[PDB]
């Protein structure tokens, strides 16, 4: 299990893709006034569960 | 078992009963979907292992 | 069968492969009349 | 709901099944079916 040497796609899929799935889903549903800030905050606030 | 590839393992353990479970679940559609599937698994386990 | 397939399976078994190839080519060429170009592709390629 | 089979299962049990069978494949317990059922019940709340 050595991330470092993974292909780009496999790396992103093993690191940030799931949280991004849930994050953009929530984003698309709520559509807050500041989407980029809202998204960054979602990633930080749910980082631990992922 | 222990030494099977992922798919073959899942095929030899849980796939058939999951097929039957998802079939009944899809047919009945209880308010209960996850709990119903787990309960189905438990109540029909004996015929699948 | 066919008639009794679920919609997704029906469309997937009928027009989806040729639509894949067609919309790909369309995206590549980008002609002045995209709809006519696509219909024409579907027609020229129906047999396969 | 009034959903097609695939959409219904996708909206109800597919995600928890993804995580469940993944964990099953990782651990491979003597009790595959019981382990799976228990996974669904213990994680029911998150889905």
């Amino acid at each position: 299990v050595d991330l470092q040497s993974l292909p780009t796609r496999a790396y992103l899929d093993q690191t940030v893709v799931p949280i991004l799935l849930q994050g953009l889903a929530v984003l698309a549903k709520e559509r807050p006034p500041n989407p980029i800030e809202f998204l960054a905050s979602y990633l930080l606030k749910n980082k631990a569960q992922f | 078992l222990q030494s099977l590839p992922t798919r073959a393992y899942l095929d030899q353990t849980v796939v058939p009963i999951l097929l039957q479970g998802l079939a009944v679940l899809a047919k009945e559609r209880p308010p209960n979907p996850i709990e119903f599937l787990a309960s189905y698994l438990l109540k029909n386990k004996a015929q699948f292992e | 069968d066919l008639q009794s397939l679920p919609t997704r399976a029906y469309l997937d078994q009928t027009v989806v492969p040729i639509l894949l190839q067609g919309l790909a080519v369309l995206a590549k060429e980008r002609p002045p009349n995209p709809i006519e170009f696509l219909a024409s592709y579907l027609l020229k390629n129906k047999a396969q | 709901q009034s959903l097609p089979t695939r959409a219904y299962l996708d909206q109800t049990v597919v995600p928890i099944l993804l995580q469940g069978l993944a964990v099953l494949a990782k651990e491979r317990p003597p009790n595959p079916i019981e382990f799976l059922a228990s996974y669904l019940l213990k994680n029911k709340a998150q889905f």
């Binding site: 496999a10 | - | 679920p6 | 993944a22």
Partner: peptide, 24 residues
């Protein structure tokens, strides 16, 4: 429509089998 159920389970099995931890 047993086919839809089987397709669903195939999606599940595919995603489990293609987990990064399972391939690399």
């Amino acid at each position: 429509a047993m086919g839809s159920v089987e397709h669903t389970l195939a999606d599940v099995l595919y995603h489990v089998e293609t987990e990064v931890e399972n391939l690399y």
